[PDB]
Design a protein around this ligand. Structure first.
Ligand SMILES: Nc1ncnc2c1ncn2[C@@H]1O[C@H](COP(=O)(O)OP(=O)(O)O)[C@@H](O)[C@H]1O
Ligand SMILES: Nc1ncnc2c1ncn2[C@@H]1O[C@H](COP(=O)(O)OP(=O)(O)O)[C@@H](O)[C@H]1O
Ligand SMILES: CCCCCCCNC(=O)CCNC(=O)[C@H](O)C(C)(C)CO
Ligand SMILES: CCCCCCCNC(=O)CCNC(=O)[C@H](O)C(C)(C)CO
Lengths: 351, 351
């Protein structure tokens, strides 16, 4: 059977698949036509059905896993569309994590000779993260930060070495947000979380702007000025609030200028998309910053698909952590985005 | 001259005025007609112009302040409308706090023989709070909580004694939010804050629903079901996420069901108003809860006008703190709402 790890989240299904590349002659016969057709379907297409996507650029090549050489592939689709995945399967051991491993268990069981092995969402995240960092992204670093994050003509994505990571704060920004303090490979706690996550960003954006996808929401946002919606400290003070170090440019009240009819009539969709992005991102950064200080952790890794192709949010997080802590905290990011749970699930297979 | 403390905030001006009631005969002559007309205007009307409001129900009677007996009055109006206040004045020592004490300083100076004494916003909050609690609300407690907050047929506003308050966490929810750890009368720090405050509630509500006032936003909210907009843990898991104690009913992603077109078409304005309220309130409660635990403080007092006539938010805060901490934390509230800074300013007069 084929090697999968599946993370069925509240918005997206993440699927990691190990394509073997060391198949001997005696192994190519012994392979059944059903297995050969799944292998070929997966590796010959980068789009599956109407909403499945293979992220070719993330592929890990010539990896050795469980004694075998192969390539590790990364595939996502909407959770919504999982019934089509299951139909395909029925028309193997599946290591499955995320909420949908439980919610859709009965649906997986419609695949006749399928054994579902449920694994914990945050266990898999941490195992996946550490594993991907340990193998590298084809020789390049999996982890990166933004050098000189507080100077935005100078700010640059640069590699960061995670070889002795502990203690690490891990902020997983998906539909919602879990924040973990990882003290060793086997010891971590969920310190806190927030329901104001990626789902809140797109949920509010769609309602405010009429955008119909994540990508369109980011595009509107890129053209927007969040200070049109937001009431700033200088709007209240006429400058800095010196005593408590709040510069005039800091947001006093997110969307707070939208209490005035005149302002609501002059604000653009793009402005509201950007304010939504800024509000959700800064809130998360503010909570992470607080957990870091309280846990005595100076490196904070943000992951999950809220940040996928989202440089606005990543740089804002890097800036916010660096500025407000005067360099004591560093925001870190990982090239494999939101796929760690799926990898972690896959790593559970020999058990 | 008349005794005022004024807190000019990002949304509302709060004005505390001390009406003397022990005026001798030799003092009633010596009083100039201008002073007599301001006194009479203030005390004979409960509405001033089109947007000024006197909160009669909050009046403290027969208070002794600075050697004099009087009644302490509480008055608010939109900051927006401050030019009309100033016109009245010019058409005295003013102790002024909040951001607008700085922003509008030049405007105050148009009142010919006015001395403006600027005081710090959070200094005045703490001084005012402690003072109002120490004098009582006409024999009744200024501070209260919700007894049995986690059982909502049993939940009841009950008086709470603040006679030895320290340490206390103070959450000031106005346009934005400041969170203070108060360790004695003179020693406190601003531990953190959030820009997702009262202004965010009404700002987003107005944009989402077409409501044109705070009160209308609460009224829509009262009729709404926030679980229509919000994606719950049970929507992801099909039940509880047991391992990390997240019951199926907890919000996984605020507004997270609004990523689906079908859902956006079936959701009501009332549902969105309630989801806005729930999202803003729980986020604040979640941050306060975290600061309390980290500061080793078990009483959290929430104040500010976000909570004015807002039992939905107060009970949700009381429930959230009690439930998620298993009784270790108590949410507290204060009868004088958002007026503490204005009182604190007034208390600065003899300096
Ligand atoms: N193609 C996409 N479709 C839907 N959401 C996306 C997409 N790309 C990025 N996102 C963002 O990613 C978030 C989901 O992240 P993910 O880590 O997969 O979490 P979950 O396990 O909750 O699905 C969404 O809330 C959204 O903000
Ligand atoms: N009559 C009102 N007009 C405007 N906002 C109100 C009113 N009543 C309650 N509010 C709420 O009170 C908040 C302002 O609280 P306040 O403590 O006066 O803060 P600030 O000093 O920022 O003005 C608003 O953001 C709103 O949520
Ligand atoms: C004092 C108020 C305290 C309120 C505490 C409840 C806040 N809510 C949360 O932490 C859930 C956030 N969401 C998540 O972690 C994730 O979406 C998962 C559900 C794990 C699925 O990926
Ligand atoms: C790592 C990200 C850290 C981000 C830190 C900035 C967050 N913003 C704030 O705390 C301001 C909230 N607002 C207020 O406190 C009040 O409205 C006042 C401006 C005092 C006027 O009453």
């Amino acid at each position: 059977f084929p090697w999968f790890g599946m993370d069925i989240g509240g918005t997206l299904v993440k699927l990691s698949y190990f394509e073997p590349i060391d198949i001997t002659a005696e192994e190519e016969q012994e392979e059944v036509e059903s297995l050969k057709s799944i292998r070929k379907y997966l590796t010959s297409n980068v789009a599956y059905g109407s909403t499945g996507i293979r992220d070719v650029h993330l592929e890990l090549k010539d990896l050795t896993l469980f004694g075998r050489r192969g390539n590790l592939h990364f595939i996502r689709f909407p959770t919504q569309d999982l019934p089509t995945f299951i139909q395909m399967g029925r028309d193997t051991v599946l290591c499955a994590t995320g909420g949908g491993a439980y919610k859709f268990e009965k649906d997986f069981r419609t695949i006749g000779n399928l054994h579902l092995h449920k694994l914990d969402e945050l266990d898999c995240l941490v195992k996946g993260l550490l594993y991907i960092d340990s193998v590298s992204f084809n020789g390049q670093a999996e982890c990166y930060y933004f050098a000189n994050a507080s100077e935005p003509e100078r700010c640059q994505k640069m590699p960061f070495n995670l070889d002795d990571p502990y203690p690490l704060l891990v902020v997983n920004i998906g539909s919602g947000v879990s924040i973990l303090a990882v003290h060793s490979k086997d010891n971590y706690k969920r310190v806190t979380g927030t329901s104001l996550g990626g789902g809140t960003f797109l949920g509010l954006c769609s309602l405010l702007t009429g955008c119909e996808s994540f990508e369109e929401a980011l595009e509107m946002a890129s053209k927007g000025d969040s200070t049109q919606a937001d009431k700033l400290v200088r709007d209240i003070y006429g400058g800095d609030y010196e005593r408590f170090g709040l510069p005039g440019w800091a947001v006093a009240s997110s969307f707070g200028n939208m209490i005035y009819k005149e302002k609501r009539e002059s604000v653009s969709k793009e402005d509201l998309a950007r304010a939504t992005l800024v509000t959700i991102t800064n809130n998360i950064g503010s909570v992470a910053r607080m957990c870091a200080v309280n846990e005595k952790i100076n490196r904070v890794v943000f992951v999950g698909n809220f940040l996928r192709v989202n440089t606005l949010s990543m740089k804002l997080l890097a800036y916010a952590l660096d500025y407000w802590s005067k360099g004591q905290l560093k925001a870190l990011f990982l090239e494999h985005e939101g796929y760690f749970g799926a990898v972690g699930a896959l790593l559970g297979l020999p058990n």
